Amino acid sequence: DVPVNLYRPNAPFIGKVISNEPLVKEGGIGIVQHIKFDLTGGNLKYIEGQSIGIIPPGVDKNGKPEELRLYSIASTRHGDDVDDKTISLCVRQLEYKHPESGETVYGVCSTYLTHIEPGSEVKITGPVGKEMLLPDDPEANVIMLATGTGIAPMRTYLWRMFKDAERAANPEYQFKGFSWLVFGVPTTPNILYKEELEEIQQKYPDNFRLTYAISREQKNPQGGRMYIQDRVAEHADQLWQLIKNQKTHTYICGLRGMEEGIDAALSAAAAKEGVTWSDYQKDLKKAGRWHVETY
Numbered sequence: 001d002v003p004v005n006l007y008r009p010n011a012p013f014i015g016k017v018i019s020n021e022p023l024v025k026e027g028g029i030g031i032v033q034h035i036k037f038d039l040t041g042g043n044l045k046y047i048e049g050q051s052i053g054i055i056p057p058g059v060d061k062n063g064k065p066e067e068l069r070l071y072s073i074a075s076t077r078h079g080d081d082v083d084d085k086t087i088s089l090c091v092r093q094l095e096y097k098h099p100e101s102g103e104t105v106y107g108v109c110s111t112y113l114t115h116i117e118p119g120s121e122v123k124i125t126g127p128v129g130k131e132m133l134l135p136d137d138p139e140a141n142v143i144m145l146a147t148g149t150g151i152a153p154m155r156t157y158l159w160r161m162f163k164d165a166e167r168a169a170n171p172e173y174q175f176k177g178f179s180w181l182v183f184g185v186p187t188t189p190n191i192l193y194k195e196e197l198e199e200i201q202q203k204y205p206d207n208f209r210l211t212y213a214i215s216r217e218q219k220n221p222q223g224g225r226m227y228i229q230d231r232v233a234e235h236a237d238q239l240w241q242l243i244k245n246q247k248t249h250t251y252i253c254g255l256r257g258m259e260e261g262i263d264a265a266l267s268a269a270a271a272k273e274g275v276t277w278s279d280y281q282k283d284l285k286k287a288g289r290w291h292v293e294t295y
């Protein structure tokens with residue numbers, strides 16, 4: 001059922017950029033772009049929670065051709081226009097320090113993508129990944145813990161769950177469970193897809209909860225900047241109580257570093273009922289109900 005590797009690096013699909021739109025609003029940090037590609041003329045199909053590869057042009061410093069980078073798919077299987085014709089990505093421009101020689105260093109594939117023009121041809125591979133798949137059970141609870149571009153798979157889940165046009169297109173999936181996104185970014189301008197996330201929460205107050213951790217605007221109880229692990233600690237008992245349900249799935253996505261504090265929070269919660277979280281979690285992973293993708 002799951003589409004996998006319909007296109008591979010040795011013979012990628014050549015798609016065309018339809019649009020490239022900014023997601024970070026004025027006064028935010030960095031550049032994150034929503035990029036939609038045309039899939040017509042090929043047979044690339046995919047589902048929610050999967051990734052694709054992009055092969056950027058050029059050679060590396062050693063003269064060798066650049067190889068693919070993976071990006072989490074940001075659209076449902078139907079694409080943003082629910083026409084089964086496109087696929088979208090949520091790409092942050094990588095840039096960084098002077099202890100990497102030069103001045104500011106700009107990531108190759110992410111700079112290429114964030115600056116790409118509509119009409120341009122792009123080498124696409126995939127789809128890949130079976131670890132971040134959403135349950136078909138419309139009564140499942142879904143916890144989503146995201147930072148930055150880790151919002152991408154969460155967008156594919158929530159759009160499938162909650163968009164009117166998705167609901168009309170997916171007779172078999174009429175979501176009635178409970179989902180909770182805890183989303184960590186540095187500023188309110190940096191809240192990717194803010195308007196649509198808040199619209200969903202307003203329409204579906206009983207089925208969707210939205211919690212932000214905004215580091216430049218909020219302090220945790222210790223006086224430090226607010227991060228996602230702080231919000232998970234604050235809501236550790238609530239989150240553990242949901243995780244106890246046989247039908248609950250949890251998804252963690254974003255740059256690596258989030259897991260240690262999330263585990264410590266849930267470990268203190270579970271310990272109150274005589275449960276060792278690390279062992280309970282191993283069983284959840286084995287059951288396919290604890291999903292992690294960090295990078």
Ligand SMILES: Cc1cc2nc3c(=O)[nH]c(=O)nc-3n(C[C@H](O)[C@H](O)[C@H](O)COP(=O)(O)OP(=O)(O)OC[C@H]3O[C@@H](n4cnc5c(N)ncnc54)[C@H](O)[C@@H]3O)c2cc1C
Binds near residue numbers: 071091094096097109
């Ligand atoms: C499954 C998966 C899904 C992903 N999904 C997404 C997504 O949805 N959106 C997205 O934007 N990215 C995503 N990424 C990351 C993405 O694949 C690329 O790694 C990223 O975009 C940077 O690639 P680049 O070509 O821009 O950088 P490169 O030119 O490849 O530079 C990367 C190198 O720079 C270094 N580096 C990285 N950060 C820093 C830093 N601040 N300080 C010091 N050195 C640093 C390391 O040497 C790293 O190997 C995903 C990765 C994986 C594995």
